[PDB]
Design a protein around this ligand. Structure first.
Ligand SMILES: [Mg+2]
Ligand SMILES: [Mg+2]
Ligand SMILES: [Mg+2]
Ligand SMILES: [Mg+2]
Ligand SMILES: [Mg+2]
Ligand SMILES: [Mg+2]
Ligand SMILES: [Mg+2]
Ligand SMILES: [Mg+2]
Ligand SMILES: [Mg+2]
Lengths: 144, 184, 58, 60, 216
RNA sequence: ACCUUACGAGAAAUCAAAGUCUUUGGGUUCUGGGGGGAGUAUGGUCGCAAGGCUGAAACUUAAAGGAAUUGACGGAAGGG
RNA sequence: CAGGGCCCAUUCGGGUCUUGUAAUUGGAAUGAGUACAAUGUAAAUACCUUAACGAGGAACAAUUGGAGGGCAAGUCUGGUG
């Protein structure tokens, strides 16, 4: 009889079975436990400002031979330490030190993106100026 | 606070962005009817989808049903009035078989071209937009006007314009000023 | 500047081998022939088997 | 692991690219006119053909 | 020329058989493609994809090309052929032969009210190849073929104007999904409906009217 | 329990049930939702103990897996 | 400047009847903008209307993302290695 009950008064069993088995999912369990509000560095927001600690030369995974040019940043709202990847060619020459950067995710919904081992965020703005505007020389930085 | 203004969106982009057949179809439509973007074609396919959804909701209803009779006659009447639906085909099954070229033939741009005041759909577009056109005795500068098939007899040039007369225009008056300057 | 250098040498190399009738400098005495280029199209890049076989040849 | 590296090389190729200046072109039309020229290049004037229509042929 | 070898080929060359409905009516097995392109001269073909298959060997991989072809004329008939060959052009040519050999009819119908010509299918109909199941549901006018691109072109080539489709299984396996859709539109003439309930006089075969236009 | 078909089913191996399942509803109970981390931590609860039963997450990863095919190999068996 | 049968039944001659390119030239048309005025408004601003001015290629110059696949669009040319 296909598993599940079929009787006309058996809605309670179907409801509680659906709740119990809804816990087996990924997105539902994450939303209902609220791990984004508790165990996420951004705390569930899309973006976050932080202060650059140092500049890292993280090497990519196999097979890929490169140095990926990320930075360590301490978040302003949490004080949490975070690694952020500075996206384009030559753009690490803007992100020097003690700066206010704005950070976003990479799009992989909390996962490390590519051959880059263990970074989950990218840099968007440095010192209030966006990184592509600096890269395309539309604008230029303040002194500090 | 005051009552909120209602608004609605009038188009919808298609589901697959890059499909070569649909792209070549919409470019044929835009070239033949003189349109500027794909948003106009999306607007017409949205309007047609709403008409088809109402007709689909009525044909599930049985015949002699009062809602089906009332709203089917009203929808058929609005379609035969604007001229998208022919005078013989008036049975709510022809409504389903309509397609976007039926709506696109009724715009003021293609009507100005078909009446022959224009020589092109692109000339028709700029003639409408630059206010040399009047569907009643009233200027219309909207190319998507959807003339109502007793207004087709009355599309003509505006009275307060050149090409309907009584004063030439800026560049003509300038050139006449230069030639009267050279005469004196 | 280096691109300037390369382009200029290219143009000059057109000029020297204008007078000399065949291929390389010194011609048939030379013992060295003039090479050509293989028009591959796009066939062999990141080399594989060709799905697009040609039905007819001009 | 290897969190260090050679940070001195950043921007190498972007600095090595020779600056080639853009040629100045006539303006392309905007709007309905641009769709008009795309329609004309695709449907009435199909001057370039190889039995299959291509939009950006490399020099054959 | 052709110089046919089948009784059916001699009959279709002589002009005794002037339609393929007689073949579909008497379930005559076609084995010569010249019958099909003689009786349906207007069908036009399209090759779906060419994917390479490989057999491992002592040194490397013997590779061959699999071509999927759909023929059809745009009212009532479709054929599906799939052929593996050493050469891509041979695979396409032989697939056009195989697709012409497998031509079956389609029962078009009405979603309601029988006013115009038949636009849609008569019933819901399913088909299955591999894990893939394709279901086909009759749609109102102006709905168009609501299908993924391959099975949309197959239903366009059948002559259907509007049909809802539902899939199940590994639908990215294109050859299996085409064979499932082929079985699904083949079943349209398999379903018995109350308009088909009335009895028929069982007409006699052209192979016995014209029995002396065979070889001897 | 076995043998043969394949009406049928299935991804196949195979199956008289693993059929009567997109033409999807005879009744009912239990379990699963990509691979790890992990049957791990932690809290209960049973046990003299050894342990049993319940049982996560952070983080990490683009496959892990099933059944078949063709090769290659075997301190496997035969033949020429 | 790159094209069809035919009037021709006048072999590679005008090409009507069109379709698009042009370091080839012409006038027409109009708002964006500016501004008397009136209207608008509690008073204004703006819209609607309207004298006067306001166009045409360095002018009144549309971007944003892309061009291996998914998924429209390179049988390119330099650079790095
Ligand atoms: Mg009950
Ligand atoms: Mg996980
Ligand atoms: Mg990888
Ligand atoms: Mg599905
Ligand atoms: Mg295995
Ligand atoms: Mg761009
Ligand atoms: Mg790029
Ligand atoms: Mg590029
Ligand atoms: Mg493509």
């Amino acid at each position: 009889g296909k598993g599940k009950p079929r009787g006309l008064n058996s809605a309670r069993k179907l409801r509680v079975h659906r709740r119990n088995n809804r816990w087996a999912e990924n997105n539902y369990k994450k939303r209902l436990l609220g791990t984004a509000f508790k165990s996420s560095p951004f705390g569930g927001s899309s973006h976050a400002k932080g202060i650059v600690l140092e500049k890292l030369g993280i090497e990519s995974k196999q097979p890929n031979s490169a140095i990926r040019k990320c930075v360590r940043v301490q978040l302003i709202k949490n004080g949490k330490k975070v690694t952020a990847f500075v996206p384009n060619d030559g753009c690490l020459n803007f992100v020097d030190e003690n700066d206010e950067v704005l950070l976003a995710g990479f799009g992989r919904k909390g996962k490390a993106k590519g051959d880059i081992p263990g970074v989950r965020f990218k840099v968007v703005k440095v010192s209030g100026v966006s990184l592509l505007a600096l890269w395309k020389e539309k604008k230029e930085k303040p002194r500090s | 606070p005051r009552a909120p203004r209602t608004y609605s969106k009038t188009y919808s982009t298609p589901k697959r962005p890059y499909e070569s057949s649909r792209l070549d179809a919409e470019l044929k439509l835009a070239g033949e009817f003189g349109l500027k973007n794909k948003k106009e074609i999306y607007r017409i396919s949205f309007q047609l989808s709403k008409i088809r959804r109402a007709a689909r909701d009525l044909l599930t209803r049985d015949e002699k049903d009062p809602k089906r009779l009332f709203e089917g006659n009203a929808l058929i009447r609005r379609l035969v009035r604007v001229g998208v639906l022919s005078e013989d085909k008036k049975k709510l099954d022809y409504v389903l078989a309509l397609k976007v070229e039926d709506f696109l033939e009724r715009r003021l741009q293609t009507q100005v071209y078909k009446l022959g005041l224009a020589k092109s759909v692109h000339h028709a577009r700029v003639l409408i937009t630059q206010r040399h056109i009047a569907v009643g005795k009233q200027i219309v500068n909207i190319p998507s006007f959807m003339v109502r098939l007793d207004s087709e007899k009355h599309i003509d040039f505006a009275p307060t314009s050149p090409f309907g007369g009584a004063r030439p225009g800026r560049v003509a008056r300038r050139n006449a000023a230069r030639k009267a300057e050279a005469s004196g | 500047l280096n691109v300037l250098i390369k382009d200029k040498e290219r143009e000059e190399r057109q000029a020297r081998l204008a007078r000399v009738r065949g291929g390389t400098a010194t011609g048939g005495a030379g013992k060295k022939k003039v090479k050509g280029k293989t028009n591959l199209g796009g066939a062999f890049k990141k080399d594989q088997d060709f799905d697009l076989d040609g039905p007819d040849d001009f | 692991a290897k969190v260090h590296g050679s940070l001195a090389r950043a921007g190498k190729v972007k600095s090595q690219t020779p600056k080639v200046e853009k040629t100045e072109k006539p303006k392309k039309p905007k709007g309905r006119a641009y769709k008009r020229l795309l329609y004309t290049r695709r449907f009435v004037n199909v001057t370039l053909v190889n039995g299959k229509r291509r939009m950006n042929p490399g020099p054959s | 020329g052709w110089v046919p070898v089948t009784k059916l080929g001699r009959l279709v060359k002589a002009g005794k058989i002037t339609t393929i409905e007689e073949i579909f009516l008497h379930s005559l097995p076609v084995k010569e493609f010249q019958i099909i392109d003689t009786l349906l001269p207007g069908l036009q073909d399209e090759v779906m994809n060419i994917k390479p298959v490989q057999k491992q060997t002592r040194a490397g991989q013997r590779t061959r090309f699999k071509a999927v072809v759909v023929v059809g004329d745009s009212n009532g008939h479709v054929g599906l052929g799939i052929k593996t060959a050493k050469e891509v052009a041979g695979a396409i040519r032989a697939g056009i032969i195989i697709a012409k050999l497998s031509v079956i009819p389609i029962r078009r119908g009405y979603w309601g009210t029988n006013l115009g010509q038949p636009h849609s299918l008569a019933t819901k109909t399913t088909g299955k190849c591999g894990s893939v199941t394709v279901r086909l549901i009759p749609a109102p006018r102006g709905s168009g073929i609501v299908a993924s691109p391959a099975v949309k072109k197959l239903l366009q080539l059948a002559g259907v104007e509007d049909v809802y489709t539902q899939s199940n299984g590994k639908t990215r396996t294109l050859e299996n999904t085409l064979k499932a859709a082929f079985v699904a539109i083949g079943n349209t003439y398999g379903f018995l409906t109350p308009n088909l309930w009335a009895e028929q006089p069982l007409p006699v075969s052209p192979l016995d009217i014209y029995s002396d236009e065979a070889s001897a």
